[PDB]
Amino acid sequence: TSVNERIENKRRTALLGGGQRRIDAQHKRGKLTARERISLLLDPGSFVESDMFVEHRCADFGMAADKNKFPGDSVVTGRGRINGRLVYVFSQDFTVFGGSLSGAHAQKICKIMDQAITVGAPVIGLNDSGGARIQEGVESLAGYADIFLRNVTASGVIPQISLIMGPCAGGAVYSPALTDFTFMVKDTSYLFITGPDVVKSVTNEDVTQEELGGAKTHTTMSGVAHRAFENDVDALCNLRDFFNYLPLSSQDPAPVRECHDPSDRLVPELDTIVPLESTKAYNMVDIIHSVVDEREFFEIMPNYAKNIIVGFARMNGRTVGIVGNQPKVASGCLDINSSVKGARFVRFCDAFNIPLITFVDVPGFLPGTAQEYGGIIRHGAKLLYAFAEATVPKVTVITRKAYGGAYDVMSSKHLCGDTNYAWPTAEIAVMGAKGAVEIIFKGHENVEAAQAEYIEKFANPFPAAVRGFVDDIIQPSSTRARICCDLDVLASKKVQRPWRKHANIPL
Amino acid sequence: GSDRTEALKRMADALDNYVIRGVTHNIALLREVIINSRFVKGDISTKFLSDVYPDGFKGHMLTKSEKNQLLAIASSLFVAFQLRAQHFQEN
Ligand SMILES: CCC(=O)SCCNC(=O)CCNC(=O)[C@H](O)C(C)(C)COP(=O)(O)OP(=O)(O)OC[C@H]1O[C@@H](n2cnc3c(N)ncnc32)[C@H](O)[C@@H]1OP(=O)(O)O
Ligand SMILES: *C(=O)CCCC[C@@H]1SC[C@@H]2NC(=O)N[C@@H]21
Structure with missing residues (x-):
């Protein structure tokens, strides 16, 4: 046997991975293999595989059986491009030892993590694992620690995207907590530390695999997964589209792409969206879609914390991040869940030089013991902090309500904002007329007459605007034009801040 | 006219x-x-419409040449978006 024959035989096995029968089962279950997923994700022919001939070196529990050797050791690693842009990937292969993590497994992932940080290219992981490989013991625990160290080091340096394409258990479930976005596949992917078998054995509770850690739970209730997609093919198609929004590294400006949508057009549809009656809700998404280039908007966590909307869009070709209230849900109030999603999004966009647009319509915070005992104070500070420390352009437009401390939390001008616009329907006050007048004229006669005078003078955006809180009051139809003008001149903005080893977020 | x-x-x-x-x-x-x-x-x-659409309105029905034109237009537009997606300002 020549060396070339041995090489060819290893190449053929590396492509089969766990073997054809395992691959057959992989398809029966409605899943693609790790290599098929990469072929879909990356530009055709752009993928270059690294370390395809690496095998484990572990010899306990008869693991040294040649029948227990598999080239690639359960991960496919390499580099490629999406639409001409460099990206690093890795994908875990469930058909080889259940996708469990070995020492060598982690080493290969770390290698990719180090090359991407050095050059400044994003890393996209496709995760699917049964947890640690118990046959090696403590070697796999060091594997996790090294991966975690790279994921922390890369934070704020390169984007880190993690798409879950199957179950994930043990220590593996923490890597999506360190990356920037986590995506899942409905009814296929899971995230949990221990399985239902442990829950039943430890405590008298009955739960199944979907209820404990299914995609629907994490995208609707726990707030862990940013979005779930119907199947593997649609998940990767949307991932390519998402990729096109982000810079390659934090040293780069927000990408600018060819755009055919005139930057100076008006949107007459905005003038009548906001009702004159204060108790009538409207859909904030109608405003967002009409302003953004070609009416394309990428919504994050559509089913979690619906009272606040965050997502990506482009204006005049440039990627921007959008944050705003949704008056339809809980009157547009802030609560614990909305502050968590908001602060996380704002901080990512600031780290990677993506401008922020804020659409404010917030009457205050969600009252009640459910929020008080939940630490609403500690959690609300997260969104205020995320805006106050931002150094990227911030353009705020107030569409209607801004009462109380929520005015400042939703990126008010006095938090180093660049511009602040009000629509004619905006009203900025410490509280509404009823509270303010009954407190001011407490115990006085003819309070209702005093309230009429108070409403005429203060129930409008003018007592704030004349003091410098608002830069202009614009016809809503011109909102897009005004924002476009600001974005194209604030893009060269640079500011300094006192040196600090690191930031200290309230947590 | x-x-x-x-x-x-x-x-x-x-x-x-x-x-x-x-x-x-x-x-x-x-x-x-x-x-x-x-x-x-x-x-x-x-009663024109009642005899033309005895089972309700179904929409415009395509013939062979019209299906080929619709497929060619939809396919070319699909690619046009795929090509626009690749045109970045050079970094
Ligand atoms: C907390 C410590 C950490 O850091 S993670 C600790 C690791 N412990 C685990 O996750 C337990 C492993 N199993 C589970 O968690 C769940 O039952 C899983 C496997 C995720 C449910 O997936 P399910 O679709 O039922 O797969 P399965 O159990 O049929 O396994 C598929 C094939 O893979 C194998 N496999 C699985 N896990 C391991 C592992 N840790 N080490 C070695 N092999 C593993 C299974 O034996 C199975 O192979 P086969 O089908 O029996 O030929
Ligand atoms: C009705 O008259 C009173 C409504 C309750 C007050 C509302 S609830 C949400 C806003 N936040 C706040 O502190 N007060 C407002």
Whole structure:
């Protein structure tokens, strides 16, 4: 046997991975293999595989059986491009030892993590694992620690995207907590530390695999997964589209792409969206879609914390991040869940030089013991902090309500904002007329007459605007034009801040 | 228009260049009736639509050449977006 024959035989096995029968089962279950997923994700022919001939070196529990050797050791690693842009990937292969993590497994992932940080290219992981490989013991625990160290080091340096394409258990479930976005596949992917078998054995509770850690739970209730997609093919198609929004590294400006949508057009549809009656809700998404280039908007966590909307869009070709209230849900109030999603999004966009647009319509915070005992104070500070420390352009437009401390939390001008616009329907006050007048004229006669005078003078955006809180009051139809003008001149903005080893977020 | 065919052709063009979005409209019905062979010839009675659409309105039916044009347009537009997606300012 020549060396070339041995090489060819290893190449053929590396492509089969766990073997054809395992691959057959992989398809029966409605899943693609790790290599098929990469072929879909990356530009055709752009993928270059690294370390395809690496095998484990572990010899306990008869693991040294040649029948227990598999080239690639359960991960496919390499580099490629999406639409001409460099990206690093890795994908875990469930058909080889259940996708469990070995020492060598982690080493290969770390290698990719180090090359991407050095050059400044994003890393996209496709995760699917049964947890640690118990046959090696403590070697796999060091594997996790090294991966975690790279994921922390890369934070704020390169984007880190993690798409879950199957179950994930043990220590593996923490890597999506360190990356920037986590995506899942409905009814296929899971995230949990221990399985239902442990829950039943430890405590008298009955739960199944979907209820404990299914995609629907994490995208609707726990707030862990940013979005779930119907199947593997649609998940990767949307991932390519998402990729096109982000810079390659934090040293780069927000990408600018060819755009055919005139930057100076008006949107007459905005003038009548906001009702004159204060108790009538409207859909904030109608405003967002009409302003953004070609009416394309990428919504994050559509089913979690619906009272606040965050997502990506482009204006005049440039990627921007959008944050705003949704008056339809809980009157547009802030609560614990909305502050968590908001602060996380704002901080990512600031780290990677993506401008922020804020659409404010917030009457205050969600009252009640459910929020008080939940630490609403500690959690609300997260969104205020995320805006106050931002150094990227911030353009705020107030569409209607801004009462109380929520005015400042939703990126008010006095938090180093660049511009602040009000629509004619905006009203900025410490509280509404009823509270303010009954407190001011407490115990006085003819309070209702005093309230009429108070409403005429203060129930409008003018007592704030004349003091410098608002830069202009614009016809809503011109909102897009005004924002476009600001974005194209604030893009060269640079500011300094006192040196600090690191930031200290309230947590 | 100056004649019966000019006014009908111009109507067909106006309907395809008439943008209504946000509600459900009846342009599909108007665009097919005006091009119906009985309408162009004039064999129209007050119960015309009830005999043409005895089972309800189904939408415009494509022939062989029209399906090829629709497939070619949809495929070329798909690629046009795929090519635009690759044109970045050079970093
Ligand atoms: C907390 C400590 C950490 O850091 S992670 C600790 C690791 N412990 C685990 O996750 C337990 C492993 N199993 C589970 O968690 C769940 O039951 C899983 C496997 C995720 C449910 O997936 P399910 O679709 O039922 O797969 P399965 O159990 O049929 O396994 C598929 C094939 O893979 C294998 N496999 C699985 N896990 C391991 C592992 N840790 N080490 C070695 N092999 C593993 C299974 O034996 C199975 O192979 P086969 O089908 O029996 O030929
Ligand atoms: C009705 O008259 C009173 C409504 C309750 C007050 C509301 S609830 C949400 C806003 N936040 C706040 O502190 N007060 C407002």
